[PDB]
Amino acid sequence: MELTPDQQTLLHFIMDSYNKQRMPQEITNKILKEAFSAEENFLILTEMATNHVQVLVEFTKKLPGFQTLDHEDQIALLKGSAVEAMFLRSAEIFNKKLPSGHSDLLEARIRNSGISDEYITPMFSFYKSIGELKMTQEEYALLTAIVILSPDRQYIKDREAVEKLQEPLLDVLQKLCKIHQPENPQHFACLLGRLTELRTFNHHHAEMLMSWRVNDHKFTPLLCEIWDVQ
Amino acid sequence: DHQLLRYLLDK
Ligand SMILES: N#Cc1ccccc1NC(=O)[C@H](C1CCCCC1)n1c(-c2ccc(Cl)cc2)nc2cc(F)c(F)cc21
16 A cells, blocks of 8 residues: 555655765766767766765665675675666666757767667667656665665575565555556566666676777776676 | 775775
8 A cells, every 4th residue: 555654764764865876967967068089988987987886885885784784795785786776877867857959969978978889779778668667766766775685696695684675675666656656557567677677787787888989998996896897 | 806895885
């Protein structure tokens, strides 16, 4: 049915942590203002991604029960979700309503950022698939939390411990889906289906970055840890 | 080895 006092408490807590992220407007304003070379964009991307991972560790640490997890499992969850979380966030930013013509220019600018064509079409397919769901800020925050607390992640020693942490969050998202879109009973299923399409970007991220039309692919030491790059 | 992730996780 409708959220319990405990669920409402958990939702507002997840929301506050989620909003500690760099504002969508701060990112789209920079892209839309002027066109940049592939070298300038690759640099914008690495700084964007470094800030994202830093803010992600802080959001993750605040997830109920995360700090009670085995420390090696804590790293495995972060390493396993960081790329997925960035693309989900990029999809969110992409689908924010902007003035007439703005989202067409944003799309065109990203399309010519330096990344190869073969990664452009799968990436915009996902962004636009996410857009059709017409997700709320609360749905994005919970889906990110659910992505991080994935028990079926590689190197996870205690899967049941992660299951126990993800289950209450899945219950809240399911309820929000019945509240926000009661005319679409498939909404919760669509969102979870979208998480499988997120997993595909996780396999091609290293290639996606190294295929960028730049002479040198320089990354920060933190990005070399979460991403499989040198 | 992920000592930056480990550092960020434990303060
Ligand atoms: N990284 C990162 C990141 C972290 C938090 C929030 C947004 C992020 N995305 C970004 O900075 C990139 C920029 C980087 C400069 C050149 C143009 C794209 N980006 C990506 C994009 C992420 C990855 C990879 Cl391989 C290709 C593309 N899809 C975006 C969609 C949007 F709508 C949007 F505004 C920005 C977007």
